[PDB]
Symmetry: D2
Subunit: 430 residues, 4 copies
């Protein structure tokens, strides 16, 4: 009596498959995993439930896992991020996926629920992005915890949740922090938003970036990438921060660092990257230049007070999907993107596949680790070993034609390290 | 018995009007022209036939001219550049427009033909982009030349044509070189492609730019913008040039300058910006890395040997409109964008409106000049006066909140110039 | 009874010669001129008097001219720009040079006077930088005008003077505008200040640039280079301009454009690049942050009101040559570089030799042109032919290993140009 | 019978004091330490022996420590890095300093030896940069170990030594890794070399960077800064790496990553930043373009085979101090800077004072920590607490006019952190 899947239109599978074919060729890390483990099926027995934006990239990840032997059931971790042609290709391949662009909140929860129970038994593995699946199980289905061998978590906000849970005796299953592998945080969060933040603002508004003042709240890995992207197109970028170290980094890169109370009067474009609530408020909106564009790229839509706009604007015109233009009592207009949900995935296609290969190779490794070597992972939050982190990167060098240097035995002795690595201490920040 | 217009779908007018509303707010130069001339209608009597990409930006230009009193009939200057919602809004406003995205070559010519004769008499003005309308009249409808008071030309290739015509006694009507106003060539050609080249490559392929080698043929104003855009996202950019000066400029900016025969073996992304034929040939395609992306942003599709691919590939798969992926005898794949037609307009939406306001304010000024002061323009090719060029720029400063400095009389005397300009000699290169 | 030369210390000639040896290897344009004309001595008969910063680069120029057969007598065009080891090497080689770092104003004039009369007759050629020699002859020695075949002028300010003179019937000798050859203005003025402005600020103060707000007055070729240099090291750069076009260029590159009245309160570093008087006044100094650094890189020291500081500060401490630190009545301190004279040459060594090879190859060509083909140059101000401008650039490509592309005859026909150039119309701005 | 100090010329003290006055104003972190601890003298009782480049910056550090109550004796950690005017000002202030620019190796060791015994008893604290003092005590004066309460270490190479020592039971005293405080490694190593690498190459050679190919070995924090500096001036930068992660970072920033065996044939400028031996060998020198410039910025001069040049060149000409130009059997020339010793300090003045304030505030904190709270530091290698790391940064925000944001209690609860920090987990990489 249960649907085998639920997508917007199965008819999009052909276009989706073409999409995955091109993407596969941009994802050597995932392709190399299949080449190494399709034969031995290290994930045989795993029943992986995934909750992570259902995009072309995620479809290649899903099929990599299946190729490695696991059974997979998936849901998106955002109501506007699914790419329907990718979801259809997956559904068609007979993998249970419950996801479509533009879900309601009740449907969003429903979709995650359809992934918990497989044909032959509940999930024994979690692949999360944001902690929603992780929190659902720990709060509504704890009984399933003993049957779950591990959790791998994709993003900063989900990772922070995990540490809050572990600090409070709640975390009941071993978890690998994938966000913090170097090859994820210093590539996906940085270089990925550097390209997909602009993509989302452009597809949504077609606005010229050059000449504009842009305000980026937060200067973490995401803000660093966003600020760099905007400045490369000629915007004057202003940064807001709560952390004196990130603030000093931004100042030393030539950015004016000040508060939102002050910057709201100057910005033409606003991007929130903090992962924190109450960044852009009604008091900020009333000070904004006419047609200021306001978006969020942080995991959850908690940074901008969109409720305030809906309750206080005198007009609200939908320009196209995910693009709303309000008119306030002061007569001025505000362009709001994706109703405040992460703009790169809501208004465009997320990070390009090559960088997502770095993130997802980390994810496959984490799944294998937890599944294949549970004795190595006590309940808590862990990091993939540096040696695996380095392997992720090495798997992407050939595609770029990078010729890496090999330490001579003489050099390796002088440096006190192995010719095959790890080449850095564990506290290295890269 | 003649159609009053011809567009893809009049039903798109509402969405288009919303598009124009947002764009108008990004185009102060055009809005300020209307504010200054709607009352006096300096273009009353003008019957302007336009041949220029039928986009949201062009629609604001078309309505600015109408507001200034002229009668206008328009066609696109490329078979893939029209934005159907913009064309519909114009058609709906009752302006005769003949344009849609994806015309055949015969239709392309047909559309230009429908603009030559107005309700009350042939065209008395030309607004061209590429020279196609200009060449059609001079070669098939010379009889209409005495009735045409002037020509204003938008782009480098069209301007070059005009000088070839003038050098050969063919040019029969006064022409203003709009491409070479400073506020056009050093803004539209540069900053505009800096943002819309990436937009087109992204919407077409979603490819990661970071980590790639990109080859840009030509280092003129368009190549300069394209190279800068690609390098800002982390691509290693190689430049090809025939001009020792542009080549030295590129080298001094840190770019490797070499030949296409050599670079075709390294590039992952190829962009042609030369305005010249035979840039990328079959011999180059056979040396390319797998899934290399190849596009053109020069006016005409004469830079890449697309015919060679169609005749020599073993497979050709249409991924989506304007995106074709070939498979060659060597087993490797080539992604070709927009069949070789300018990629920013064929795969995306062209330059953003703000920079297009600079170009189109120049165009309106040129029309007024020629129409309103023909005694000032003998047959030949001219430049708008520097004072008007500076006025275009000044009209866009307020939107950006630029506080310009005013020379004191003391300073103006020392510099030997007027406090209100021109502030530069005519040979100034900016 | 006349000195054969006058320098700080002939004993520095050996170190200077070593300097010139290294420089020669960085100046292929000048070396290639010698290789082509030492045999035929096209300048035989020329008695060239030069007034241009007596640096290592200028010494290679002086010897290139001598090698080409002319007789040369030189003076510096600034009291603080001479490089004593270079002046000594020249003096030693037996060329009459009157120059040393740190001349008084009376001495500065005296030195120029010692170059007017040669062993065998007055000067028959002028090589000027700033117009000082040009103005001295036209105002105190007009009688020598009929004997002077030509003038070649190095910089923007001198070129502007020439046009003021020509517009007023004063210019009595043919002059070639060397500043405006493309290979000079778009390389020396831009890329040269991009490297030597920082060099001067650093050798003078050792100040960290990152984190600072820097204010650059003017956004011409010099301001463009200076702004780019400062921003590359992490300074937040604010620009002041009087020209709406340059102001819009700066805004579209992400720079805040405002007035000095406003920026004087924010800057930590101030650089004037306008070529205009009254840029930084006492009213600006009283608003400055403590230890703000203030310098000028424009030709003459007329941009900053240094007299105001000397008359109004409560203290003035010389830190080292060309570096003065004042203390104002408000208790705050101002660091002034080179007493307001061009900072790159006053506090460092000017532009590096490679870019100076572009400028000086232009200068040698101009001398040959005027001297060798006077029938081609009526009284007035002219530009070197584009073909020579392109040759300057081509002569520097090999050193950089640039592989330039050659047009096929097919391509050259399509473009309507010669395979050997000129490749651009005369109004091209590059 | 022992000298009270030993410097090049005490007569330079006045100029040095002026230098320190300017520097103090650029070092708020150190000034704020004095303002907070001069009253309470937390270092009273400490007898700190320092071995760290004797520069203007280090002089402000030395006086900050004295102000905090310690007795200090200093030596430089490099034979060419001392700034004689700074050493003289210190000597004059009556602090025992043994250092001068250009020491022989025997003298270098002698100077360190003069710092071990104070008027009233051996050293009870070490402030090291490179590990030389640390290794001298552990190997020749172990008997003094029980009397030493702590070690604070400045740089990557010294920190690596410490971990090698701790891993081998040799480390006998508690050590704080100062290099790895975030405010040191991500500011001094990066932004500092970004400005002082160019300074050293420029003061030494005056070479144009634009147009050159530069090869940077290593892409750690130092290579990242060096590569960014060179590319900002127009050099094409090639990177060599042994670490797949750093290699992928460099590729994604647009740099070609290859081997030295390959790059030695292309580079015009070579900079080694690896901290490893055998980077540039005789086989590399024989392939180099004429007048290639070769330097090292890593701690010890072990990266370049300078011995090979001295033994194999046919000529060796000293251009000026720290600049040697060789001529090889193949007729080509090699410019070697500072005989291979760190170029920023050997040929220029090291990092500017502002960034050095970040490093030295960390150093003062470490000294206070170890001295004042030894119960908190067991034998081993430790990190300063994140809260102190953040305080270093906050102490430099005011000088830059940074307006930092304060978390509301609501926000701090949502983020699960204190309004006053730490704002990041311990594994954060910034
Ligand atoms: N959309 C995407 O593709 C994508 C990719 C990576 C991560 N993410 C998400 O982006 C957000 C941030 O990630 P990250 O890796 O940059 O986290 P980060 O910790 O590195 O960064 C964010 C910063 O925000 C600052 N900040 C917190 N509250 C603030 C406030 N009120 N005002 C100003 N600054 C404040 C913090 O000091 C911090 O430096 C998270 O929600 C994360 O899950 C999105
Ligand atoms: N798509 C757009 O939005 C847009 C905007 C502006 C202009 N254009 C078009 O872009 C093209 C170029 O414009 P531009 O303003 O840059 O012209 P430009 O003259 O400034 O530039 C092009 C350069 O190409 C070089 N070049 C010519 N043949 C070459 C060859 N075989 N190999 C390598 N280099 C070669 C030339 O030396 C030249 O510097 C024209 O067709 C123009 O009309 C497109
Ligand atoms: N020191 C050097 O090595 C070197 C090299 C090249 C030229 N120069 C000298 O540098 C100066 C400028 O050269 P350029 O080639 O950049 O000239 P440019 O004409 O290209 O530039 C200067 C600009 O200053 C602007 N400006 C004028 N008055 C102004 C005012 N009051 N406030 C703000 N902006 C103002 C103008 O609009 C102009 O764009 C001249 O004196 C020139 O001779 C020095
Ligand atoms: N001169 C200065 O002012 C200053 C300031 C900071 C540190 N330092 C010194 O600079 C050097 C490096 O510091 P860091 O903080 O960058 O270290 P880092 O560890 O961050 O960096 C160096 C890198 O070199 C790479 N590498 C090692 N051997 C290599 C080889 N054979 N070929 C290519 N790459 C190789 C490593 O993988 C590594 O990423 C150390 O000696 C350090 O003490 C100098
Ligand atoms: N194309 C994509 N497919 C899947 N996940 C993506 C894509 N782009 C960005 N993401 C993820 C979205 C994030 C925030 O939830 C991550 O941290 C990031 O990995
Ligand atoms: N959005 C746009 N609308 C109209 N014309 C455009 C747009 N973007 C670029 N162009 C034009 C296309 C060009 C080449 O034909 C021009 O030179 C340029 O002005
Ligand atoms: N090293 C140098 N030698 C000679 N002239 C120089 C040097 N650096 C800059 N200049 C010149 C100084 C200028 C301003 O007078 C020029 O325009 C510029 O060519
Ligand atoms: N001006 C300076 N004074 C003292 N130490 C410096 C200076 N510049 C760089 N350094 C140090 C030299 C280094 C390498 O030994 C450090 O890691 C760095 O902190």
């Amino acid at each position: 009596d249960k649907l085998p899947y639920k997508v917007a239109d199965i008819g999009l599978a052909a276009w989706g498959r073409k999409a995955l074919d091109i993407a596969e060729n941009e994802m050597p890390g995932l392709m190399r995993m299949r080449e190494r483990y399709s034969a031995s099926k290290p994930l045989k027995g795993a029943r992986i439930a995934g909750c992570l934006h259902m995009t072309v990239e995620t479809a290649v990840l899903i099929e990599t896992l299946v190729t490695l032997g696991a059974e997979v059931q998936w849901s998106s971790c955002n109501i506007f991020s699914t790419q329907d042609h990718a979801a259809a290709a997956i559904a068609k391949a007979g993998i249970p996926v419950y996801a479509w662009k533009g879900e309601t909140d009740e449907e969003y929860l429903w979709c995650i629920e359809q992934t918990l129970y497989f044909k032959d038994g509940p999930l024994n593995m979690i692949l999360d992005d944001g902690g929603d699946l992780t929190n659902l199980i720990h709060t509504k289905y704890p009984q399933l915890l003993p049957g779950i061998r591990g959790i791998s978590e994709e993003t900063t906000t989900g990772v922070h949740n995990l540490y809050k849970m572990m600090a409070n005796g709640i975390l009941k299953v071993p978890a690998i922090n994938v966000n913090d592998s170097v090859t994820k945080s210093k590539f996906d969060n940085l270089y990925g938003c550097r390209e997909s933040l602009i993509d989302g603002i452009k597809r949504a508004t077609d606005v010229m970036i050059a000449g504009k003042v842009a305000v980026v709240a937060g200067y973490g890995d995401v803000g660093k990438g966003c600020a760099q992207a905007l400045r490369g197109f000629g915007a004057r970028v202003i940064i807001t921060e709560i952390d004196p170290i990130n603030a000093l980094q931004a100042a030393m890169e030539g950015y004016e660092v000040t508060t939102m109370d002050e910057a709201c009067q100057e910005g033409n474009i606003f991007v929130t990257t903090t992962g924190c609530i109450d960044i852009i408020l009604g008091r900020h909106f009333e000070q904004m230049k006419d047609d200021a564009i306001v978006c969020n790229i942080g995991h959850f839509d908690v940074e901008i007070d969109v409720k305030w706009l809906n309750e206080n604007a005198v007009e609200k015109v939908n320009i196209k999907p995910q693009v709303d233009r309000y008119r306030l009592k002061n007569g001025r207009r505000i362009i709001l993107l994706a109703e405040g949900r992460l703009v790169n995935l809501g208004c465009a296609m997320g990070h390009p596949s090559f960088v997502m290969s770095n993130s997802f190779t980390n994810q496959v490794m984490a799944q294998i680790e937890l599944w294949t070597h549970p004795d190595k992972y006590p309940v808590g939050v862990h990091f993939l070993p540096k040696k695996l982190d380095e392997a992720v990167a090495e798997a992407h060098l050939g595609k770029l034609n990078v010729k890496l240097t090999k330490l001579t035995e003489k050099q390796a002795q002088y440096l006190g390290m192995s010719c095959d690595g790890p080449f850095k201490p564990d506290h290295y920040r890269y």
